[PDB]
Symmetry: C3
Subunit: 99 residues, 3 copies
C-alpha cells in the first residue's frame, strides 16, 4: 500500500509526461510537414521553370544554327561581290587607257 501506491504515483506521472511528449511530437510533425509541403511547392515551381528554360534554350540553339548557315551564305556572297568589284575596277582602268 505504500510501495504499490508509490508505484502508481510514478506510473501516472510518467503517463502524464508521455502525453505531453506526444503533444509536442505531433506539433514537431506538423511543423516538419509545413516545411516539406513548402519544399514540394517550390520544387514544382522550379520544375516548371526548368522545363520552360530547356525549351527556350532548344529554340535559341536552333536559331543560332540557322543564323550560322545564313551567315556563311552571306560571307560567300560578299566574297563573290568583292571579287567581282575588283574585276570591274580593272575593267574600268583598261577602258580609261583606251579613251
Amino acid at each position: 500500500m505504500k510501495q504499490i501506491e508509490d508505484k502508481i504515483e510514478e506510473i501516472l506521472s510518467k503517463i502524464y509526461h508521455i502525453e505531453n511528449e506526444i503533444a509536442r511530437i505531433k506539433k514537431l510533425i506538423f511543423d516538419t510537414n509545413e516545411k516539406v509541403d513548402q519544399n514540394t511547392a517550390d520544387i514544382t515551381t522550379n520544375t516548371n521553370s526548368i522545363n520552360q528554360n530547356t525549351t527556350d534554350i532548344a529554340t535559341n540553339t536552333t536559331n543560332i544554327n540557322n543564323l550560322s548557315d545564313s551567315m556563311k551564305q552571306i560571307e560567300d556572297k560578299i566574297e563573290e561581290i568583292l571579287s567581282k568589284i575588283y574585276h570591274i575596277e580593272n575593267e574600268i582602268a583598261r577602258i580609261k587607257k583606251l579613251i
Copy 2:
C-alpha cells in the same frame, strides 16, 4: 485493493491510447519521409537539368558572340563594297560623257 484496481483500469486504458497514438505517429513520420525522399529525388533531377541548361546557355552565348563579331566584319565589308560601287558609278558616268 478496489481503489488500486480502479487506478490500474485507468492506467491500462491510457497506455492503450498512448500505444495507438504512437502507431499513428509512426505512420505519419514514414509518410512524411516518403514525400521528403521524393522531394530529394526531384531536386536531383532538377539539379542535373539546371546543369545541362547552364552548359547549353554557355555554348549558345559563345556562338552568339562569335556570330556578332562575324556580323560586325560583314557590316564593315558592306560599307566598303558600297563605297567602291559608288566610286565605280562615278567613274562610269564620267566615261560615258567622254565617248
Copy 3:
C-alpha cells in the same frame, strides 16, 4: 495482490518501452528535418541558378533577335548591291561596244 504486483511491474515495463519509443520517434523527426532542411538549401541554390539561367536565356534571346534583324538587313543590302553590280556590268559592256 501478487497479481497486482505482477500487473504494476508489467505496466512499469511497458512505460519504459514507451519512453524509449518516444525518444526514438524524436530522433526520427530530427533526422527527417535534416533531410528537409538540406532539401530547402538545395532548392534555394537551384532557384538562384534558375533565376540566373532565365536571365541569361532572355539576354541570349534578345541578342539572337538583334543578330537576325541585322542579318535580314544585310541580306537586303546584298540584294541591292547585286542589282547595282548587274547594272554596272551592263554599262561596262555598253562602253566596251562604243570604244
